[PDB]
Amino acid sequence: DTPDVFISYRRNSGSQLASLLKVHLQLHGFSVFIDVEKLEAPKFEDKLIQSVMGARNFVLVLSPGALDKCMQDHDCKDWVHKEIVTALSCGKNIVPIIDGFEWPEPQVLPEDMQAVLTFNGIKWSHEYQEATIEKIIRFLQ
Ligand SMILES: [Cl-]
């Protein structure tokens, strides 16, 4: 329950890229967890997500509009928002992956996740996936 990488992603827009990152990393011997259930169940406590805390790295798939559902989510109901907050609280090495994503202004995001904009992103390249994956692995711990 302590893999190398946790992959956070938006279901409707980043499912295939998050999956491609996962199997690429597995080809290099890394263990990876990804949430494909994403049930709309409520966690009515400010609880850190266990799977994020256990993973040694936090990879964030920034597909188009991936953080849209995080805006005004001050009650922290959104899955991706809660995952990012857990990663920030635990001091995780956060590695955002950019695939046609416009970095929004910090004011439109809840206070507890605005710190995610300060991490270095890595642009994804379909033509040079192998080269991109090696760069991602260099940013891993
Ligand atoms: Cl989602």
Q: Is 138 annotated as a binding residue?
A: no
From ligand 1's centre to the CA of 140, what distance in Å?
A: 24
Find the 10 Cα to ligand 1 centroid distance in Å. Answer: 4
Instruction: Take residue 128 and report the two structure tokens written for it.
Output: 């040079």
Q: Is 56 annotated as a binding residue?
A: no
Q: Resolution in A for the shown PDB structure?
A: 2.1
Experimental method reported for this structure:
X-ray
Active site amino acids: 83
> Domain map of the chain by residue range?
1-141
Per-residue exposure over 99-135, b if at least 16 CB sit within 10 Å of its own CB, e if not? bebeeeeeeebbebbbebeebebbebeeeeeeebbee
Nearest-CA neighbor of 25 among 75, 59, 65?
59
